[PDB]
Amino acid sequence: MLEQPYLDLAKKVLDEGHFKPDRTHTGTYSIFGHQMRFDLSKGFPLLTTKKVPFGLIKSELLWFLHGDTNIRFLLQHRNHIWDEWAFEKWVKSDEYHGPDMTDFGHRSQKDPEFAAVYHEEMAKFDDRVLHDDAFAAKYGDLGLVYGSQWRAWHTSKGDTIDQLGDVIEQIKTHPYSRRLIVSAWNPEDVPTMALPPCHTLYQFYVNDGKLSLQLYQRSADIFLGVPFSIASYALLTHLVAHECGLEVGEFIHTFGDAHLYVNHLDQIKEQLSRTPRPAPTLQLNPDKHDIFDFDMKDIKLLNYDPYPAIKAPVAV
Amino acid sequence: MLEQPYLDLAKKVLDEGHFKPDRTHTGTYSIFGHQMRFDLSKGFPLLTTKKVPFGLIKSELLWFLHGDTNIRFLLQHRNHIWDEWAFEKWVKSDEYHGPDMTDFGHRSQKDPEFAAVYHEEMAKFDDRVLHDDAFAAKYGDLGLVYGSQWRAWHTSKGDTIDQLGDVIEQIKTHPYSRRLIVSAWNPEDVPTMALPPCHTLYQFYVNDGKLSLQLYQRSADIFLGVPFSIASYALLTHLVAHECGLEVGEFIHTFGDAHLYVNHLDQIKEQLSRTPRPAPTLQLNPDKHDIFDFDMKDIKLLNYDPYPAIKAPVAV
Numbered sequence: 001m002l003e004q005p006y007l008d009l010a011k012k013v014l015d016e017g018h019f020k021p022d023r024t025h026t027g028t029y030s031i032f033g034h035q036m037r038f039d040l041s042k043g044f045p046l047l048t049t050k051k052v053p054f055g056l057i058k059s060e061l062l063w064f065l066h067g068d069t070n071i072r073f074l075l076q077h078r079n080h081i082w083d084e085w086a087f088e089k090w091v092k093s094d095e096y097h098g099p100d101m102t103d104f105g106h107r108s109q110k111d112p113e114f115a116a117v118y119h120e121e122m123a124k125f126d127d128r129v130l131h132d133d134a135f136a137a138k139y140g141d142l143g144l145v146y147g148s149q150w151r152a153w154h155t156s157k158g159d160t161i162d163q164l165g166d167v168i169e170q171i172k173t174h175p176y177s178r179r180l181i182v183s184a185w186n187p188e189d190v191p192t193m194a195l196p197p198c199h200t201l202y203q204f205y206v207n208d209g210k211l212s213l214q215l216y217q218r219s220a221d222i223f224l225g226v227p228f229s230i231a232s233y234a235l236l237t238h239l240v241a242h243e244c245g246l247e248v249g250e251f252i253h254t255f256g257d258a259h260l261y262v263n264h265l266d267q268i269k270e271q272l273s274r275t276p277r278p279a280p281t282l283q284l285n286p287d288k289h290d291i292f293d294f295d296m297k298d299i300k301l302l303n304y305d306p307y308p309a310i311k312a313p314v315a316v
Numbered sequence: 317m318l319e320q321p322y323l324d325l326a327k328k329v330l331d332e333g334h335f336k337p338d339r340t341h342t343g344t345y346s347i348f349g350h351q352m353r354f355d356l357s358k359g360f361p362l363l364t365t366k367k368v369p370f371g372l373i374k375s376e377l378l379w380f381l382h383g384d385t386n387i388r389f390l391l392q393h394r395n396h397i398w399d400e401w402a403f404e405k406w407v408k409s410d411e412y413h414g415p416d417m418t419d420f421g422h423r424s425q426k427d428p429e430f431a432a433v434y435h436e437e438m439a440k441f442d443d444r445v446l447h448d449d450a451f452a453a454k455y456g457d458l459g460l461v462y463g464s465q466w467r468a469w470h471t472s473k474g475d476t477i478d479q480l481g482d483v484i485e486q487i488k489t490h491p492y493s494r495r496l497i498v499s500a501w502n503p504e505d506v507p508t509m510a511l512p513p514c515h516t517l518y519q520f521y522v523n524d525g526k527l528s529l530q531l532y533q534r535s536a537d538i539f540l541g542v543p544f545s546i547a548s549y550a551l552l553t554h555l556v557a558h559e560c561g562l563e564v565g566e567f568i569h570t571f572g573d574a575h576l577y578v579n580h581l582d583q584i585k586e587q588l589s590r591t592p593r594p595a596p597t598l599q600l601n602p603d604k605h606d607i608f609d610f611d612m613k614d615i616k617l618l619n620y621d622p623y624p625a626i627k628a629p630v631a632v
């Protein structure tokens with residue numbers, strides 16, 4: 001099936017992967033260097049062997065495309081995928097006067113019911129961000145996230161470079177260009193970032209009226225990470241094409257350190273016992289073409305019949 | 317043999333590649349997305365099926381490692397691989413008072429004996445660079461080349477970031493880091509560069525006391541380009557390891573647009589008729605360890621028994 005390269009990736013680290021310790025203190029069976037490709041004309045690569053929230057993917061992509069870096073847009077669409085980054089900063093600020101959330105990450109997955117007071121404090125933060133502009137502007141804005149890196153690269157002379165926007169015009173004006181690249185790896189920021197980009201960079205390729213895309217992911221969480229990455233960049237590929245009047249080609253995914261967290265073995269093992277189903281169909285708004293002005297309503301996922309979802313203990 | 321992934325890469329674009337037009341106006345049979353790996357414990361990947369100048373590779377690597385961006389170092393070692401970039405600029409300057417070298421690139425491979433006056437003018441330039449400091453400093457310095465990008469990344473606040481130097485300390489202090497990256501793709505320079513980096517970025521990986529490296533090459537000339545790239549980055553991998561006290565692992569090579577120029581078909585076809593030989597052995601100076609202070613004398617290539625060299629018409 002369309003999503004077999006995924007399953008195979010997992011099986012290869014399960015069988016061939018080596019134990020290697022990491023940043024976050026769980027263990028991982030990790031390999032280094034791996035490539036897999038999805039021909040996007042056969043269907044959209046949203047895993048069927050496990051239910052994956054397209055809405056979270058869609059809303060996260062649209063946020064990116066807007067050069068938006070404020071968590072408020074996400075919360076508006078019920079996407080809480082990025083909260084903890086803003087929360088981390090909230091806690092470390094003069095204004096925070098509440099139940100000390102030190103290392104809350106570990107201290108929630110752990111036995112103490114820190115998570116009880118955690119979630120209510122988070123609910124407060126989220127509401128503040130959603131309703132108080134001054135607050136939203138203060139802690140709701142992350143700054144150095146993809147949308148910033150894609151649509152507002154800060155140069156030395158102080159200006160802003162719209163990498164993505166430029167790259168698209170280049171594809172229209174020079175389809176056969178071996179320089180269609182968008183990078184997220186700024187060497188002058190990585191050393192002070194909490195999470196340097198996982199999706200380091202991507203490259204477009206046009207040939208035969210087909211638009212392909214290759215994504216280089218320096219680090220990957222096979223079970224929790226990779227499923228999203230695939231649908232996100234396959235969706236990007238579809239959108240950019242919809243604009244450049246091109247047809248959709250393949251989505252090549254290259255990996256640096258592809259790893260499986262030791263606390264995800266049973267989970268991944270269970271998923272591998274499933275038999276893939278016919279992939280879903282993506283349907284974009286024909287009349288609308290400016291992908292930078294798209295909204296949830298313009299992207300329709302069709303025929304998605306996934307197996308139920310596998311719950312998994314997140315690391316940290 | 318050790319270098320079989322190379323030959324196979326070529327055969328795949330020969331058989332599976334599609335015709336696609338490019339920047340330089342020759343044609344190319346090109347594919348998009350491809351990965352190959354060389355286990356550096358089996359030998360050094362300097363092609364045997366064709367004679368490849370290790371000296372040019374070695375001297376080019378040492379120049380890089382010095383953060384050197386002046387062609388003078390190269391000319392000193394008889395490496396003329398980068399001349400035409402400095403020449404291009406010489407010609408476009410107020411001071412140049414000589415036989416107009418317009419589009420000399422095309423106009424040399426072509427029928428006119430422009431190349432006659434070209435090579436003597438180049439010989440003059442090269443001598444000026446080699447002997448006159450003011451001149452060397454004016455046109456002999458390229459500025460935005462690898463060594464600059466690796467050892468002197470210019471930030472917004474005006475300073476200089478020693479990416480490579482930092483990355484090495486990181487490997488010593490954090491071997492299991494999924495962030496060991498050195499990038500050459502600055503978004504604020506690419507739009508005005510004559511040749512944006514082909515070797516966009518690379519990533520290190522440590523595990524089991526083995527140091528691996530993955531290189532992402534956005535564009536590749538299978539016949540003329542790739543052979544060098546392999547030996548250059550395999551040598552880099554060996555040097556960095558020699559320093560970090562680590563053992564050498566693999567060299568993974570990932571490609572964006574891997575292409576074969578249409579005027580190289582017979583040449584590549586001939587090379588494929590050859591049977592690989594036992595690869596050579598790299599021998600570094602044990603006593604010397606600071607790779608940034610290495611010189612030609614510290615890198616010994618052993619047992620290199622290559623087939624004669626295949627001459628090939630360079631494109632442009």
Ligand SMILES: O=c1ccn([C@H]2C[C@H](O)[C@@H](COP(=O)(O)O)O2)c(=O)[nH]1
Nearest residue numbers: 023198219220221225226229494495
């Ligand atoms: O879309 C995403 C976001 C995060 N991660 C994972 C990758 C690593 O498991 C961890 C980041 O760790 P570092 O490699 O940066 O240390 O989060 C993913 O796999 N995919």
Ligand SMILES: O=c1ccn([C@H]2C[C@H](O)[C@@H](COP(=O)(O)O)O2)c(=O)[nH]1
Nearest residue numbers: 178179339514535536537541542545
């Ligand atoms: O080490 C090198 C240097 C240059 N090139 C080639 C790649 C392309 O054939 C051309 C640069 O073309 P663009 O893709 O940038 O347009 O030179 C290589 O393959 N390897």
